[PDB]
DNA sequence: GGGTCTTCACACCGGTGTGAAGACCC
DNA sequence: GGGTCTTCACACCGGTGTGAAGACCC
DNA sequence: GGGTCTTCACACCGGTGTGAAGACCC
DNA sequence: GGGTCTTCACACCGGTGTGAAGACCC
DNA sequence: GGGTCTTCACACCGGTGTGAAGACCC
C-alpha cells in the first residue's frame, strides 16, 4: 500500500516487517537499536505502484514527497509496535532515503526502457499515461538496456574481452610501480542492447511494482550483459545523489574523470554522457562548479576539451523524469544505423 | 583551562561563552537551538596550552582525546546554565570537531616551524620538550612558513605574478568555451619563506596558546605571502580530514589532481608533496585506495607517473606529529642551497 | 532488554526497579542515597540473553563491554526518574560490576556444562552457535557440575563424610591451641557429577536467561551436592577478580595455599587446578607474580613442587570463555574411566 | 603548623605547596586534576611536632584525628587558591592517609628507639613526656634499630651474606622449574643494632619533626643496615593497615607465611613476631580470623605450630603506641646477653 | 653518552549489596 | 513463640603518590 | 444580596466531492 | 552613502544497510 | 568439507560555524 493501511502491516510477516528490532543483537561497532529495512520498505510502499508510469495523481506529486515517503511510512510503523522506544538516527534516515532515490528513480527509467523497446520492435506505443511518441524511425537494433550497478562494481566487466584487455594492460602496467586506478562506480549505466537479446522478452515486459521478485531482477540485470557491449555504445551514465553539499559534488567528478579516460583514450569512445540527478541543489554554487573541463584532455594541449558533467538535473515530478528520458532517447538513438 | 574549571566559565563573559543561545534568533534554514562557538572553544581549552610543545603529559595523550575535548568541554558548560534544555545535534558535533582538528594540528606544526626557524638563523635548539636536533647545515634561507588556508581560497594568489599569468591564461582560455577549473582548497599549505622575511621575528616567536590574539594571526598569516613564493618552492600540502569514509577520501584526490596539474605542467614544479592526516581510517580500504596514480600524466604515455597522495598519516599522539614534521624538514630542506 | 528499552523500565514494578531510593531509610553506617539492585540489574539486561551462547553479535563483543553494561544501564534509569538527584558512588559501581563478573561468567560456563552433559548421555551436539565438538569418547560418567559458591561458604561440606572427618580432625586439632584455618571461598568450584544424578535432567537443561527463577538455581545448585563428591574429583577451582592490583592478587593465593593443603595432604588429592580469570591485568607484574610455588610443599624438602595458580586468563570476548572451557573438558575428562 | 595557619601556606613556596595543580599535565592513565603532595603534607602538619613525644595535649588526642588531619589540612588549602574547582577523589584521600599512617606511626616508634638507645648507653631517661622507665639492665648491646621499608624491597638484603646464600640457593632452586617466592614487603622491620654502630650518635639523636631533612633519613636508614643483622635478631615486623576489610586482612598473612618460612626453616629463626596495627577493625571478624596457624608447619606433622599474627593492635591515642613499644622492648631484650 | 626525563609497578584504603543470624514480641 | 525484622560480616574492585628503571640524545 | 458561578452566542478556520475547464498528443 | 547588517556558499564529519568474502566445523 | 554464519568495505546523505559579499538607508 502507498498510504499506510493499518492492517496490511498487521497482515505482513515479522520477516517482511518494515523495522526489525536488533536491540538484542548488536553488530560490534554501531549501537543500532532499530534498523530500517531498505529492501522491505521499497516493497511496502512501491510494491504495487511505480512512479511516473502509474496512477497519474502520483506522477504529478512533488518528487521530494514520493522519495522519502517510505521513511515516514516506517516511522508510523515504528510508533505502533514499539511505542515510546522508537528512535532511528537521522544519519540512518539519510542512507536509506538516498538509496531509495537510487533504486526508485532507476526503476522509473526502466519503465521508459521497456516502452521504448516496444516501439522499436513494432509493438505499439502504450498510452495509459499520456506520453508523447518519439519521432524516430522504429528499428529493432535501437532498444536500450538500463542497468543498476552494485556497490563494489568496477564496470570494466561489461566490455567485450577484445577491448577489456587494453584496460587490464593499462591497469597491470600501473601495478608495476605499486599504483592503481581506484574508482567509485556510478549508480546507473545506460547501454544499448546487444545482438543476443534482440528478440528476448525480458527487455519489453514492463515492470508493475517493486516487490522482491521484480527487485533482484533490477539488481542483477547487469550480470546478463557482463562482457557484451562495445565501448562506443555506452550512451548515458547517471550518478544519483539526493542532495548536494559543497564537497560531496566532487565524488561524481572523480567517477567521470576516470570514465572519460578509460573510454576516451584507451578504448577510443568519442564522449560518454555523464550527468547527475539531484533534488536539493540549494546551499551550493553547484551549477557553476559543474562547468568543469575534464582533466584528461588538459595534458595534450587543447586538442579536444569538453565538460566532465553533461547536465545537472532537478526533477520536479516523477513524470518529468520519464519525459526527459524519452527526449534523450529521441536524440541519441538517431546516431545509429536504424 | 584544559580540564573545565567551574569558575573560569563563570568568570568569562556572555560574549566569550562557549555556547550562545540562539533560541530567540533562527537563521531561516536550520532550526539550531544552541550553537557551539568554534572560535571560543579553542580559546577556552587550548587558550594557554598547545599540544605537542607544552606539558608533556598532554603530549603523550591519545590524539583522539585532545581533539574532541572542547566538544565535551562545551557539553559540560551546556548542562550548567541550560539545564535539561541542552541539545546539540551530532551533525554539529562533527563540524566543529573536524574544524578543531583543522586548526589545532596546524597550530602544532606552527610550533615546529618557529623552532626550525630558530636553528636556521643561529639561535639555539629549544629543549623544553625533548625533541631531537635535526642534522642539517643551519642556513637562514631554509626557514619554512606554514599557512592555514581559508574556505573560499584558490591558492593561485600565493605565486609570483610572473608565474600567476600562465595559470590565468589557462583559466581564461577555458572560459572561452564556458568552462573552468574549480577546486577545493587544501587545509594547509607549507611553503618556504621568501627573501623579504629572512630577518623578521614573527616567524620565530613561538606561539603559547590559541587565544583570539594568536588565532587571527594563524588565520591571516597567508595574506603576508600573497604573491611571493616561486612555484618550485611549495614543499608540502596537507589536507585535514578527521575520519575517512569510502567516498569522502576522493575529495582530497580532486584537490591533488588539480594541484599536480597547475604546478606539474603549466608552472613546471617537479612533484608537490600532498598528504592526508587522519585519525580514524577504519571501515575503509583507504591505504590501498590512496595508491592512486595521478590522472595528469595518464595522457602523454608513461613519461612520468607517480602517486597523487604521498602518505596517509595516523598520528597516535600529539608529540608524534611534531616528530614527523621535524624529519620531513630534515630531508626536504637538504635539497636547497644551504 | 539488552539495550535499555524506554518502556519496559516503565512497564516494570517498583519492586523490580533497577534502583531503589533508600533516601528515607539509612542503614546506620553508610549514607547510601541510592543503591544499585544487583539481583535486578542482572535480570534486566541478561534476563532473556546469555553471553557466549546467544545472539552471536553479542558473543563477539568486547567482554569489558558486556560486563559493566548493567551499571550503565542503571545510570540511564537513574537519570530518568530521579532527575538531577542521581549519584552512585564509584565504590558502589565496582562492587556490583565485580559481582556481575562473578555471576555472569559463571552462567556462561553453566551453558558449556549442559551442552557437555548432552554429548555425554548420547544426545547431540547443539550447534546453534558454531562450537567445535570435543574429540572424547562419550561416557555418561563424565558430565560435570559447575557450582557458584556463596560468601561465607567453607567448601568442606561438599566432600563425602568419610573424608570430611579428617579435615574436621585437623581443624579441631588446631582448636586445642586456640588456632584455626580461616579461608576465603573461591567464587567457582567445578566438580564432576556424582552417581545419584546420572539421569537427572537439571544438569542438561540449558539455561536461557538470568531471571530470578533461573538465578536462585545457580546460587543454590551447590546445596544439592553438599557431601557427595570424592576429594580426588574436584577438577577446577576458578577465582573471579575483575581487575588486579599489586596486592589484591594475593587474596587468591591464600585461597589456593589452603586448598592445596587440605586436598594435597590430608585428603590426598594429586593436584587441584586453581586459576584466576581477570579482565584488566595492566598496572601489575602479575603474570610473573603468579609463577609462585605453593608454600605447602616447601617444608618436606623438594619432593613435589608446583604452581599455586594454574593460569591467569584474560578473556577477550564472551565466546572465547566458552571455547577455553570446552578444551579444558576435552583434556581433564580423558583421565577418568570413560 | 599543626592547625592551618593562614599565612605560612602563603609564606610557603609553589614547589612545597600542599597541592600541585596538574590540570595542564595528565599522566596518560589517570585523569587526576589535583594531587595531594604526600611528602609535603607530612612536612606541613607534622613538620615541627611529633605525636606521642611532643605537646602532650596532642598525645592524648584520638589517633584517628592525628592521622587524617593532613588530608583535611590539604582540603582547606585547596579551597583557598583553587576556589570552586577543587576535587580530590576519595580513592586519592585513602592512599595518602594510609601512607600517612605508614610514615607517622613509624616515626613515633623511632622516638621510642632513640630514648631506648639513650638508657642503654648510660645516658638518662628523658622525662619531658611522663614515660615510665623500663626495668631492664642497661647494656649497650641492646639498642634497637627501627627501619621503614620501601615499596619494592625484598628484605633478604638485610641479612649477613653468609646467611643470604641459603635463601638465594632456595630461590634459584625454585627458578629451575620456572617458579619463585614473590612477597609483599612489610611496612616496618624492627631489628637490633649491629656491632658497627654501638657508638654512633645517629641512633640516639631524637627526631624533632618530619621535615624533608629528617624524612629521607627515616626512608633510607634501612640502607645502612643492608647486610648486617643475623637472622635470629629480627625482633618485630609491623604491617601497617589503616582499616581492615574481610579480604584485605589476608595480604599481611602472605607477608608472614613467607617470613615464617625463610626465617623459621632455611635460616633457623625460632619465631619472628609479626603484628598488624589497625585503626578501624569494625565490619570484620578479624580478631578471630587472625587466630590462624602458620601454613609452614602444617606439613611436618604437629612438631611446632603457632600463630602467624602475634597481635592485632588498635591504638587509641598516640601516646599509647609509645607505651606499648616500651613494654615490648622491656620483654624481648631480656633474652639477650645484657 | 652519563645525564634528564617519561614512563611503570608498587601497596594504598574506602563505600559498598546480599545472605544468614541476630533482634524481638505474640 | 515461630515468625518478621534489624542487624552484621562477607568479598567487591578502583583511583591513587612515589621510587626506580626506563626512555632518549649529546 | 452583590458576589460567585453556570451558562451562551461570538467568530474561529480546515478537510472536503463534483462539475467544468484545463492539460496534452493523435 | 560608507557603514551596519542580513544573507549565502564553503568544507565539516558521522551513523548508517546490504552484498560478498570472510570465518569455522562437519 | 561445502555449507552456514560472522564479519567488513561500500557509498549513503544531512545539520552544521564562519568569512565575505550581499542587503539597505543615511
Ligand atoms: Mg551517490
Ligand atoms: Mg577536509
Ligand atoms: Mg574475588
Ligand atoms: Mg599495608
How does this model look, in words?
Chain A is 32% helix and 9% strand. Chain A has 338 residues and is α/β, with parallel strands linked by helices. Chain A has a single domain, classed as Restriction Endonuclease, CATH 3.40.91.10. In chain A, the strands form two sheets. A five-stranded mixed β-sheet of chain A has the order 3-4-5-6-7, covered by helices on one side. A two-stranded antiparallel sheet of chain A has the order 1-2. Bound molecules: magnesium ion (MG) (4 copies). One magnesium ion (MG) binds next to strand 5 of chain D. Chain C binds five DNA strands through helix 3 and helix 6. Chains A, B, C, D: Mg(2+) 2 binds at residues 102, 187, 240. Chains A, B, C, D: Mn(2+) 1 binds at residues 102, 148-149, 187. Chains A, B, C, D: Ca(2+) 3 binds at residues 102, 149. Chains A, B, C, D: Keywords: Calcium, Metal-binding.
